[PDB]
Structures are given as C-alpha cells and as structure tokens.
Amino acid sequence: VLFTRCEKARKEKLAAGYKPLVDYLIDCDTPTFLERIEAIQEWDRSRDDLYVWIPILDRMDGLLLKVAEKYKYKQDPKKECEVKLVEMEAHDVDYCLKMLKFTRRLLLNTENRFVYSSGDVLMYLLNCPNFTIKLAVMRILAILGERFVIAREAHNIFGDHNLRKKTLKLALSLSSSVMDEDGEHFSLVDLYFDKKKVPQKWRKLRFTHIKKVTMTTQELCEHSLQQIFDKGMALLPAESWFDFSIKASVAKAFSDDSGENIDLRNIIIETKLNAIAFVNTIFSPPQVSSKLFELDPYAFNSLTDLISLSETKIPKELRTDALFTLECISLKHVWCSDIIRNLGGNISHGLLFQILRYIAKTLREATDEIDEEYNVRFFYLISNLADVKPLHESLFAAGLIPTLLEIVSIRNCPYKRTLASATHLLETFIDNSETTTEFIENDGFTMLITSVANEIDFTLAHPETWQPPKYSVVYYSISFRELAYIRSLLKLVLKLLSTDSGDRIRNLIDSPILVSLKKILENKLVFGLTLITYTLDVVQKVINSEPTIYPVLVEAGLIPYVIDNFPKLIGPSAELLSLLPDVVSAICLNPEGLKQVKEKGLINNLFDFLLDADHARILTGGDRSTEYGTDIDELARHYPDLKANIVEALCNVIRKMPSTFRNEREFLFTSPKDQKYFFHRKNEEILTDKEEHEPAYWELLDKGTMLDTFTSVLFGMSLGNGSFSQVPQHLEARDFLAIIFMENPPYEYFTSVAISNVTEVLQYLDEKYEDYAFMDVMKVLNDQLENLNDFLNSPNDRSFFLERDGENSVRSCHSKLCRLAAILNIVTNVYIDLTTLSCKRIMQIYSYFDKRGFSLIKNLKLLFQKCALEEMYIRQHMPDSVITETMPLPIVDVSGDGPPLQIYIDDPKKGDQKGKITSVKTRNTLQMRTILYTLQSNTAILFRCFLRLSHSRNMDLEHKDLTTEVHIFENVVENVIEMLKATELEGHLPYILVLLNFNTFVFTIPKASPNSTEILQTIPAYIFYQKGGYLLYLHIIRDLFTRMTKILSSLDNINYIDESNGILTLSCLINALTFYNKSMQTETMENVQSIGKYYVSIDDDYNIMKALTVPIKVMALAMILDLDKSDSLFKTQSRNVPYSVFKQLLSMLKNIFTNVNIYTKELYELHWDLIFPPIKKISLFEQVGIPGDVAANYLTDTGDDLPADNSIGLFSPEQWEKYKKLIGEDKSIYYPQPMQAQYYKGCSSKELDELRDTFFNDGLPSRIFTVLPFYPKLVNAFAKTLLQIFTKYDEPTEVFAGRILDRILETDLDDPATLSSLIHLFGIFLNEKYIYQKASHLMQRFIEYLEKSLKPEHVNTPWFSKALYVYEIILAKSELPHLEELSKDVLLRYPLLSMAKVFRIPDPMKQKLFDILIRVSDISNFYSALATSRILIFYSRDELYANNIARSGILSRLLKVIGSFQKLDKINFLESSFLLLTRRCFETTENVDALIRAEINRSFTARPLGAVRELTTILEEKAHVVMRSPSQFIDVLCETARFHEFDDQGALVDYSLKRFLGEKASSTEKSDIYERTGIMHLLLSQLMAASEKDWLSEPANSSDLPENKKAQLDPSRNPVCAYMIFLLKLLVELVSSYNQCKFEFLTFSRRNTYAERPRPRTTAINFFLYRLLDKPVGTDHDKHEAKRREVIGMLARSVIIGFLATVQDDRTTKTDVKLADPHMNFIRKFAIEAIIKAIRNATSSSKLLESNHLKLDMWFRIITSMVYVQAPYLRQLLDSNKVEADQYQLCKLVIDLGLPSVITEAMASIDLNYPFSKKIFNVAVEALNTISSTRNNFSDGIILKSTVSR
C-alpha cells in the first residue's frame, strides 16, 4: 500500500483517537480481557475500524492461536489427518466462543474490517467434533467471506483443500429440501416443524470411498463424535471424513427424537446456511444450481414461506440464521425475481406487505416485540432487494408507498435504530416520479413536516439525556442514536430536495423549521453537528432548486444573518470546503445575495484557516483540493475585482507564509555508541535497528502537511492564471521565496512532492515572466551559497566531517545544504535548459555574466571536490559490511545525471538491499550520502549544456556572447579541471578516477537521439589543447599498461562490481580510449572554421578541428613508437590487453591514418577578447580614453590591425599622456601568438609521415603479426589500414604470407581449433588479393602440401569446418573460371590478359583429393556441410566429374541427414545451392549440352532485333549459360554466332553479334528411362518417413500468435512440413527439367523391384493417383496443417500439371508436337484410369461418395487445370507455345477417349440430398464447359523458376 506520509500518519492519528480507550484492553490481563470478551457486545454508537485494535486483534489471535495446537487442531492443508476431531474443552470452547462471538459482534459492530490482525488459526480450530467451535467458526467464516466479497474478494488460504472442500460439500452438506418416504419433504418451510414424517433409518450413515462404510442404527447412539470418527477412520480412509461427520451429526440428532434432535438439526442447518451464503459468495448458479438445483429446487417459494414476524412462532435462531444467508443469496438478481414472484410482487397483501403492515403496527404499539436486529436486517435486505427495477415497479403496483407510510407516522418511539433503518430503506427505494406523486398525494408529504416539528421540539425535550459518543470526538453534545436517526432523516430529505423541488418548495416555503431553522444555526450542540453540513447541503440545493425564493426567504431573516455569522463558522469541513463555491460564489451575483456578500467584505473571511494544516488535511491534499482549486474560480468569473482580495486577502497571510515557519526537531543525530555521525572504520559496530533512513516529519509537519493541500489548490487555481494575474503585480515571488528556504529545510526535500503543483504553477511566470526575478533568484541564491561557503571552504585533505564527528558542524547547515542543492536541481530541470530558447532569459543570463561572470563555478568546484572525497575517504573508514547493504549512492531512484558507475559492493544487479538493519550513522546520512552525487553531475550536464546553444539555439540573440561566452568557457574549463589538474594517480584513485570518468562523459554534446555519438564539443577540446593534458595522459598510459604488472579471472567477459584492481587500473582509462578515437573524428563531430579565416594577423591559418586532429596524432605516434621500443606487447606475449580492449585498439588504431586532406598549418591560440573583429584595439582606445565610437572609427576604417601610434584624428595627441601610460612595448602582442606542436614542429604530416616510414623502416607493421595470435581472429575487419600501408608499400607482407605458407605447416596442428583460426586470418592475407594474382609458385608451393595435407578422413579436422572456406580461397582461384589460361593467339587489339596467375590447377591434382573428397563424407557442422556442397556444385565441372559425383553415397549422407532433420534454422542457402546442384547433379549431357546447343540458335539468336546483342551486352549476359557448363557451353559456342562487321584487312572492329552460326537416334526410347537407377524404391519411402512423420503437427511455437500469424500465413512452421515443402518443390522441379525425373517415379514401391522398361510397379503411380497426394485428414485439426492442405490443393494441381510437361526447354515451342515416344505417349494417359475408378469409387457407397469429396473437390480443379493446362503456379516457367499441342493433344485426346460424359453420370450417381452436392457441381459446370469449349476450335513466397533462371 502507498502509505504516503499522510496516510500512515492518519493511521497513527487513529490510535490517539482510540488507543487511549483500547489502553483499557491493551493494559489488562487476558483473564480481565476474557471477562471483557462478552462484556462489550457492540458500540452504543456507530461502527468503527479495527486498526487501533490491530494490537488487541493479535492479542486475541495469540489467546486463540496456540489453542489449535492445544488439541493438535493446528491443521496442515497438505497432511491428510484432518487433525483428528476430538472434543474441545467447554471452558476453552467458551474461551473461544467468547472471542468468536465477541469477534462475530466486533465484525458486526465494526466497519472497515479489512485489517485482519487476529487470524492465524484459520482452518484449524474448526476441526473439532462439536459444532459449538466448528459451527461458530463456520458462521464467523461465512461472515468473513461476505466481508471479503464486500471487498470484492485478508489471508490467501484459497489453496486449502481441507476447509475449502469441507465448505464446498457443506453447500449440499446433506441436501437442501430433502425428501422422505412420506409425501412431506423435510421442506425448507419446516424450520422447526417436527409435524412431518421423521425417518429413523438415518440413525446410521453409509459412505462409499468404493470404500463403503456403516454407522448402523443405534450404533450411532453410544459412539459419540470422537468414537464415531474413530470407527469411521477404521471403516474409512483417514483422508476423507467430511460426509462421514456430516451424516454422523445427522444421525446423532436422529439418535434421539428429542430436543437434541431438533437442536442439532438447527445446528447443522445453520452450518449449512453459512456454507450456502459463502458458496453463493464464491459460487454462482452455474455452480450453485449445478450442485443443488438439480437436487432440491424447492428453494424460492419455500424461502418466501419460511419465516415472518407475522409468523411470530419460529424460534428465531434458524429464522435469523437463514435471514442473513437467505439475505446474501437473495442479493443476486437470479434469485431476486424468484422470491419476488413467489410473494406475488403485485399483491400489497401477501407476506410481501402482510408482514410489512403487521410490523408497522408492532411499531405503533412498540410492545418490545420488535427485534431491532432482525428489523434493521430485513430493512437493509429489501434495500438490497430494490435491485430489480421492473420488480420495483411491480411492488409499486403492490401498494408500495402508502403501505410504508403507515410507519412514517410512528414517532416518539424508542427504536431510533429501526427508525433509522426505516429511513434508510425509504431513501433506498425512492427512484420514481410516479412514486413521488404517490407519496406526495398519499399525504406522505405531510408526515414530512409532522416529524420535522415533532423532532425539532423533541430536541429540547431531552437536553437531560444528550449522551453522545463517549470515547470519540463529539463536535455536538446530543445523544448519538437520536441524531444518527436524524442523519438518516436529513439524508432522505436532501436527496428528496432536488426532485420535484419547485412545486414542493413552494408547498413548504415555511416547513416547521424554515423560520425556526435558526435553531440549527446555533443549536450546534443542541441540534447536533455535521447535520449543519447537511443544512449547507439544503442551502446549495436551494441555491439551485429555487434561487428566486432566496430574496423571498431573505425576508425570512435567516439568510442575511448567515452572512453576518458566516465569517465565524468558516472551518475545517471538506464538503463545505468543497461545496463552498457552489453555495457562495454564484450568489455573489444574485442582487440580494450580491449585496449580502459585498457587505462585510466576505472574501477575507473565506480563507481564515489559510494557515491551518487541519483544513489542508481536510481537503484531501488533492482532488477535492485541486478540484476546489479549479472550482472557486467561479467567483473570479463573477467578480474579478475581488481577486485583489483573493490576491491580498491572502498575501497578507501568504507573504507571512514564510514567516509562519517554526523551529522543529533534529535531523542529524549522533551515534548512540560513540556519538559520531560517520563510521570511522571498516570493522565498526552497527547502531542496529529496523527503522527508515529518512525521518518523515516535514510533510507530516503542519507546514509540510498544510503546504501539500496548499499547492494542490494552488495548481487548481493558478491554472489559467487568476489572482496570479495580479499577485506578481502585488507580490514578488523571489521576495516571497523564503518558503524555498523555510526555517529548517530538511534532508527530506527529496520528499518535494508538490513540486508539480509548485513548479508547474511557477511555470506560469515561466509562461509570463521568467525575468520576474530569475537572475535575481539566482543572485540571492549565490549570496546564500557564499553564506554556506563556511565549512564548504574545508580542508582539502579528507573528511574532517568524519574527524569532527559528534559536533554540530553540518547539523547547523545540514538542512540548508540539501534544501539548496535539490531545489536548484529542480529549478534547472523545470526551466534552466537549452529548451528555454527565450531571448529575454538569454539577456538576463548575460547580465549575470556581466555582474559576476563565472566566479560561482569556483564555489562549485570546491563543493564537488569535497563532495565524495569523504565517502571515498570514509569508505575505508566505512564498514563494507555496512556499505554492502547501505551503499548510499547505489540506491533506488538513482537513475539520472549519467552515473559514472561507482565502486559498488555486491553485483549492481541487486542494488538496494536495505530494510534489514539501520544505524544512526547510516540513517541520518544514508538519506544524504546517496543524495550527493545526484545533487552533482546534474550540475555538470548543464554546464556542458552551456556550450553549444547558439550553434543550435540561434533564435533572436545578440553579440554579447561573442566575447563573454568565450570568456565564460575560459572561466569554466580550467576552473574546475584544477580539481583534477593536481590529482596524480592514486589515493585520489577512487574519487578522482570517477571524476575523470564523468569528465570524459562531459565535453561531449549530449547528442545520442538516434543512438548517435555525443558530438564532443570543439571549444573545450581546444581550451584543453592549450592545456595539453592530453600529453599528460599520454604520459600516464605508460604507467597504465605497465600497471598491468601490478594486476585476473578473465580478460574480456567479466562485469559487475565486487573487486577488480585491474578494473580500477583501466576503469577510467576506457573512456580516454574512445575519447581519443573520436578525438580524431571531426567527421563524427561538428566542423568549426579556421582561425586564419577569423584572424588575418596570424601565421597558423587552419580550420581549428581539422588542424588539431594532427598534432595530437603526431605526439600519439611518438608515444606509439616509445611503447613499442620496449616492444610493449607489439611483438611480445601474455595476451594482456583484453580481447575487448584489444579490439578497441583497432578504432584507436584506425584513427592512426585518419587525416584531414589539406596540410595543417600549426595551431595558434585562444582568447576571449581578441575575437574577430579585434575588440582589443577599441578596448585600448578607451583605456587611453578614446570613446568606443571614435575608437571604433579606426578598426572599422582598418580592421584586423593595430595602430600603436599617437596623435591620430581619433587618437589626438592629448591622448599622448594616457597612451604613454598604456604603452607596454608589446602592442604588437595584443593579438594571439602561435602555439606549437609540443615536442615537435608541424601539427601535420610533417613528422607523422616520416615516423610512419620509420615503422616501415623499423618494420613494426610486421612485428604486430608476431602478436596477432593472441587476439587476431576477427581483426581481419581491421586489415584495411593495413591495406593503406600496403598501398604505400614501404614493406612487403606478401612476403610475410609466403613465410607463413612456409610456417603454415609449422602450424603443427596449431592448437587444433586454432589452426583454422589463425590460418583463416592467414588466408585473409590472400583475401587481400591484389598480388594474389601472382605468387602462383608460392601459391602452388603450398598447394603442393594442400595435396599432401590429404586428411582422407577430414572428420579428423573439425577446424576444417570452415577451413573449408580458407581453402575456398584457393578454390576461387582454383580454376578462376578455368578458361585454360589460353592466349587467344588471334586478331585482338585488347589485352584480355591473365590478370591472376592460377596455373589452372593441374587436373591430376584435382582427382587425388577428390577421391578423398568423396572419401571423407561426415566431418562436422551444418554450415561446413553448406560449404562442402557449394564447393562441389561450383565443381562437378567436367560433367563427368559430375557423373562420378553422382551415386557417390555422400548423396545418401545428404538425404538421410537433412531429410532426417527434426529442427533446423537457415538451410535456405543450401536449398538454393541444391536447386543449382540438381540442375548440375542431373546435368544430363543431351538435356544440358544438346539442350543449350538447340537453344544456341535461340540463346545468341534469342529472336534478335532482326540482331546485334553486343558481346558484352550478351556474352557477359550469357553468364547463366556460361556457368551452366563452361565446357559444354564453349562446345555449344563452338557453333554459335559467327558475327560480322570485321574490319576487312585482317582487322576487327565490332562486337554486335550478327550473321551465321559459329561456322554456319542419339537418344532412344530409354534415354531418360535407363537413366533411372531405382533410387525411388526406397528413397521416397525414407522420404515419406521424414514426411509422414506427422507433418501436420502444431510446432512448438508462440510467435505471439502460434497458429494465426504463421499457420494460415506460413504453414511451413511445423518443422516436419518445413522440409516436406522442399521435397515437393525440388521433386517437381527436377521432374519438369528432365524427362527421366518424370519417369523416375513410376515403379516406386515400399519394397524394391527393377524390371524391363521398369514394368510399372503400380504402387508408385496408383498411390500418387491416391492418398499420396490426398493424404486425407479428419478435419482442420491445426491451421498449420489445415492451411498446409489448402496450399496443397493450390499446389498439387501445378505439381501434376508440370509433371505432364515434356522437357520445359528448347522444345517448349511444342508448335505441332502431336505425340511422344512409344514409352511416353501412353505415359500421358497411363495411370489416369484408377482416378476414373476413383471417381467411380465415389459414385458407389454414398459415404464413400462423401469420403472422396476433397478428391472430387480437387477433381474439378484438377480437371480444369489438366484440360486448360493451367494452374496457380503455372506458365511462369512455360510458354504459350508449349500449349499449342498440349492443349490440343489433351482436349482432342480426351475427345478420343470420350470419357467426360461418363463422369457426368457420377453426378447421376448421387442423390441431391447433400448440402454441397448442389454446390459441388457448379465448379464442374466449368469442367463441363471445358468439355467442348477448348476443342470447339478443332476440326508471396511462391517460387517459379525457369531453366536459365537456374
């Protein structure tokens, strides 16, 4: 719970209210408590919350907590012993029943019972044989569950089985209405009716569980409770005893037929009633009726008939016991209508109002026959039963109101309670205007005034009694119950006030109180209080009901006086203080009330409580407050003139508001162990406690508390202005901002909660006038700082605060310090930012620059310096046993101001670990210590924000910034860096390192937006250039890498903060790395322009950033050489640099080359006043005396120069005296003078190039290679600077690679799994190809070993997984599109030379390891397989190489590896490669070589323009066919495109291919038949096993939509089908491409068979014609498989249709092809007929007819695609020429068959009584249309790829 200070504070305030009372209980013994248990009953007055009694609640708990263990009743809802039911001791039962019933009454007399501080024995004591304990607990528990649902459903015991199921079964413990052998039922109407048949067989019980038991008759007469359960568990399983006990109690009641039988009957009845109430609370008719109303629905009318006070006979025990249960169930709508109709809800006579009028009379007599409890209970029940409005009118038709008004006349009776309940029910039912005119005309609108007068007089009839609440505050003095009944009266009257008000107000303009209402005006203690709140409610309603009567009743004299006493009665009433404008504001304009308001000047009277936290708490500190802060603006609309009052009527008080504050408690406290604020050692004692670091007092204090609601209303009103339109004009905020310092403004300003309502309101001036102080605020702010600059100016050594502990030092200033810091952070956050943009604040800021400039920053430097040095210092004095939990800064809410991650204790993952123990040193300080860094570094982020501005701000601004802003930055950079300028390395380490971290963080424009780089301000960079501390760092780094030696677990992959001196070593260092990297990156930074451009009187002309890039780099090169002088790690070992840091170097190494194109002409200077145009000359002109204008005349006349002369026109000789004094003999030095490349001369390549050569002269770029092995693996990416050094050469690394080739066997397995790595980089030397052209000898000088490497079982080379690729480099060269390196020895005027020397990979070499190639098969890795495949595909070159690679077994490896896959990820690349493979793997010479050769006059010809298709425009565009088979391609080219336009004379000038060919059976019936090798016979069987292994399953997918985003979208999800799709695609593709693949399937069978002309083993073909494609399934079990089958219906069509193709190549013309070969022509028809039978199979067995359906469904689609030679995935590979005889020799072919009309009988073969049989043939009709239509002329992810596409 968000127990914000206010909430819990109110909770304690409750204690003061009644803790003094409960002291009675808290301060008494248990026996005394025991005596009081039943001596309390219920309040004489209203209910109360039990929070303050939470202690007494737990007292009762303990009193009755262990008693569960007293008889073991402490039960586990996991141990099935049920804590054996043994009788609880009567007095101990009473000890419990006392508190139970006392707890029962407490609940029933308490309100807001959600505290739950007296539980813990919940399921436990109820486990007792006696119903006394068991039923008392059952009742109180039903009530508890009701309150719990009343809380919309505090223990979470719902997991219990024992009690939960006990109650669930008690819902039908035995039965609701029951039935007996006699016609009677034991009807519910038999509450106490022993006047019916009473079966005696129920002396026993029988309980199966199949474990059946008995308690036979008269056996359950001596065995009682304990013995019953003993023999039960003897007969029963110990776990289950519930129904045994239920029926045993039933029998024990039965055991006799005496009062015990009736008594125990009532007891079990009430148990069941509590169970039913709770069940309906938790269960619903879906469950309730599901349990009973299939058992005994004799409930509704029964209950309607059971009980009635008219039936004043029922022993009220069960009557009431049901009542509340009955009531609870009746609350439901389902049951409401039930008993409503049972009563006959339109009677006025039945029990509906029979009892109503009976009780009405009972009230008139008041003969103590009035059970106030029962009375009020049904009152409120019917209040609840007002639920059903239609039945509300039904009752309105049941003589509703007048039947009720019989009671309204019953007064002067003692039953104020039931009288109050009657008023409440009356208020409840009132909904109708027809009910109004009923009541009004019933004469009910006379008993109103009747009771009015009666009780108004009665008020003074009993001043003697007047016994208000005793133990609670009583504003009034009259007896409680009376004026509570009156509260009900007033509520009813008010709610009636609004409706039908005009006529009735006229009726009772003088109700018997109207003129005597003044009774109430002053009868505060006589007529009660907060009833006057309800009089105000009347007034407001009147102020809206009939304001016209206001002046009329102003004449009554009551209204005018109210204004007279109005100032006095203004007080703490939220309602009033919420409804005040509703009552007052509007009347300000009503003439009568207008004058009445104007008199006395009521505005000031309104506020009065202005300085009263009571009222602030009253108004909720919000909402109502804020709401009111918006509402009371209504009078402002009425009377803006009063605003001056509402302005000053308060400012008299507001302006005093700062003056209000009083001194308050301490904030710092010394340790009650040594009286010290801070721990002085790592091993220091803990001032242990479970307190909270922050003492919450201010907000709790009236000033904070009041100001809460204050700001609430402030933000309500000031919103849109108001008095604030004049308060700034009246009051000055800064003058008023003493509220910002207050008196003791504590540490807990972090509790600055009203800020929004504070700052947001303040923004209105930010909207109106920041300049309404702003710089003034900050000036007085500084003033304060200087005032605080007392122990701010403290020792620079360490924490004197630690030393001075036990003293008032900070205590004195403490609160002010945090006050100030946090308030300023807030000010900055809200206002001070680059977002302001307003020129006015810009100029005011400039005015500040003028008056002080920057000196504040010095105080800031000192403060920050002292800031955490202490904690840093104390940290060593600070118990890490305490830091580990305390960890001041590493605490919740610490998220901003770029935390320069600090030295934490545990993993930062866990962070805050408070709450266990506290310490005064921790407590008062942790609240502070955490704060400090937050207070700071938000300073620094803003400081950096003070840099760019106009560069990006550039709204209306001025020149002032020209000199000052530069002056400011100078007054900034060194000013704070001085803090660290001196700090050396260590001891300073912990503090200064982090300081440096954030320092590097700053100096960078806070620019990331698109995650970009902070833009690394140019200005401060140059202001540090003049500082040159870069070079200081270049010195330090010497220590730093050497500081490795002073340093573990790992190098690169360790994080978090426990302890790492190594981390300490480079912690700060890391930033300098990135800094320097981007330090060279002006491209990543802005681009300032040149000082030479700015200043013409200079030598160093240069763009600032561009020049400064270099000199840092020349010094960096010097440093590089220095470090390498020792070799550092440059050619050394120990892999010290972290892999991460090593990689980092590369960036830090890339920059090495990074260079500005133009030569850099040295770096010059910095000056704030020597700005262009020089202000210095004019400055000295008026320093001698010449005014600016006359002084300017010179520079504007000359510019960028200095006169240094006397007796000029503007510099007249009388200026000689004031110039000679100014003459310093250095006037020429009044301009910047060049800076230098420290330790060097040229801030340019002047030395960097020479030293680069020196590396090359010194061969360093190779010494690195020696140190690569440690972290070289991915550095390949950084082989590009390398590339530039090689462009310059100056050293050969091709020589290095050759030496490695020599060394490449010195690899000597090179740490297997590191062989391939370092050698991958080595081959990456090759990837630096250029020279790769040559070295063929060296290249061969290694390929010789490559041959010798052999590894015939490369499985022995897992590192060869991708040394596959490192070879693949040698592969790419291998043939280098072989072309036999032939010299064309022809007429050419172009080189076309051998750029790369390859020695064309002598063929004998290839076959050798190619034998190994096939002789290695399995090695490792999925992508190694990808490679291997792709290599062999690029290969399979000679096409006899391809032949041999066929039947290579490794094919089988591929098959039963991949197809055996269960779940793979990205085989897609292999799948593309394998499409191309199959194009190559089945590279049928004729069907590829002769294929192209037929396509040649169509490849080059390709239907030319009619024919140029220039060589490079065609030949280089023949790449597809070129690589189809470069060998067979050239062969096909051997006869191609003779080509013309050759320059006659043995000269060639042309490339437009045109004229002639290159110079211009083989197959057989089995050509594409015997090529079949029986692969399918088991290939497709294992393929199906891969596929038919439930290719329909839902994958283990979520996707955020497991089967709707990816099932009807991408059915491939199921991994099983993820490759079945591939199977289909590839198989159909290879079919289409080559005839044999089409023939490859015909003989498939589960077994294996091979016959002449492969005699069709019908298994294959028939199955294809059958389920093979259909794969029928029950239904759309999964959208994955469902959409799968859907797309398959889309696909199988195209699949088979393409199967019907011929070659899908050169002969695609098919212009007049009207036959196939002898073994193909019938293949066209072939197995079809089984489908004709399949069609006929459907025709028979109408369910078989229904079975086929989908086949038929497809059949129409199938037949349409067939005849029309069309499909969804068709013609994307085909030609319209293909369908020239295909369509013909299909349509006319079937015409030859004459088959179609036969299937028409298939329709004739059905009945028209199927839902889709009508629908089914519609598609057929087209198929029917297909019949002659075609021959009538006779007599997305879809992949479609052509052949050349392959």
Author numbering: 2 to 154, 158 to 213, 236 to 1073, 1076 to 1534, 1539 to 1592, 1598 to 1872, 2220 to 2230
What does the paper say about this structure?
In addition to the closed ring structure, the Tom1p^His^ dataset contains particles in “intermediate” and “open” conformations that were reconstructed to resolutions of 7.79 and 7.10 Å, respectively ([Fig fig7], S6C-D). The distinction between closed and open/intermediate conformations is modeled as a rigid body hinging of 30° (open) or 15° (intermediate) centered at a loop (1316-1320) in the middle of the Body domain at the opposite side of the ring from the N-terminal Head and C-terminal HECT domains ([Fig fig7], 7C). The resolution does not allow precise modeling of the change in conformation, but apart from the rigid body rotations, conformational changes appear to be limited to some repacking of the interface between the two halves of the Body domain and modest shift in adjacent helices ([Fig fig7]). When aligned separately, the N-terminal and C-terminal halves of closed, intermediate, and open conformation Tom1 superimpose closely. The hinging motion, centered on loop 1316-1320 (green), is ^∽^ 15° and ^∽^30° for the intermediate and open conformations, respectively. One possibility is that this ∼29 kDa domain occupies the solenoidal basket, perhaps extending above the basket rim, and that it retains basic substrate proteins in the central region of the solenoid. It is also possible that the shift from the closed ring to the open spiral form is important for function. Mutations expected to destabilize closure of the ring conformation were reported to compromise E3 ligase activity of human HUWE1 and similar mutations of *Nematocida* HUWE1 were found to destabilize the protein.
This family is characterized by a large N-terminal domain attached to a smaller C-terminal HECT domain (Homologous to E6-AP Carboxyl Terminus) that provides ubiquitin ligase activity ([Fig fig1]). Tom1p has been implicated in the turnover of excess levels of small, basic proteins including ribosomal components and histones. We determined cryo-EM structures of Tom1p to reveal a helical repeat solenoid architecture for the 2,888 residues preceding the C-terminal HECT domain and an overall architecture that resembles the published structures of HUWE1 but with a larger fraction of ordered residues.
